[PDB]
């Protein structure tokens, strides 16, 4: 609603964003099997979920 | 200019970003023939030049 | 601690993760050696520190 409480939102979105970005890293640094990319698979799911709810909540509040 | 307006480019750019982001680990997966990645590349060179022109925005606005 | 500043700090963080997002998009680019990749990994590193820093840094300022 208010701007601190958007400046709020879009850090948490910034931060999620980070973590899947250190997933890519990493990812592309393994790739220098598939089951094996299991919990990559999980965790980049599971912030890209995330970071959709963040965003949709950042354009809700403008 | 103000503060809503920039805290609007700083979302935008993120939601770009995100776009991105998902590019890259969908490309990952794929990962895990040069002529079949001729879509993914044009969205990823379209992405960074769109969030190219939000960053260049946000920076002028300071 | 102000908005103007907290705003600042959001897009130098943007801006950092726009860095790493191009270095992945790269990557990805060339896995379509090891050794040939240290600078990549370099940069990477780098910009991974910088971007932590700059999240704290947001962080503290609420």
Redesign the interface.
């Given at each position: 609603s208010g701007?601190?409480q958007?400046?709020?939102n879009?850090?948490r979105?910034?931060?999620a964003?980070?973590h899947?970005?250190?997933?890519?890293?990493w990812?592309?640094?393994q790739?220098?099997?598939?089951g094996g990319?299991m919990e990559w698979?999980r965790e980049?799911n599971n912030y890209?979920s995330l970071?959709?709810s963040l965003?949709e909540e950042?354009?809700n509040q403008?």
């Open positions: 701007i601190v958007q400046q709020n879009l850090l979105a910034i931060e964003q980070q899947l970005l250190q997933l890519t890293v990812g592309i640094k790739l220098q099997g598939r990319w698979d980049a890209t970071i959709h965003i950042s354009q403008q």
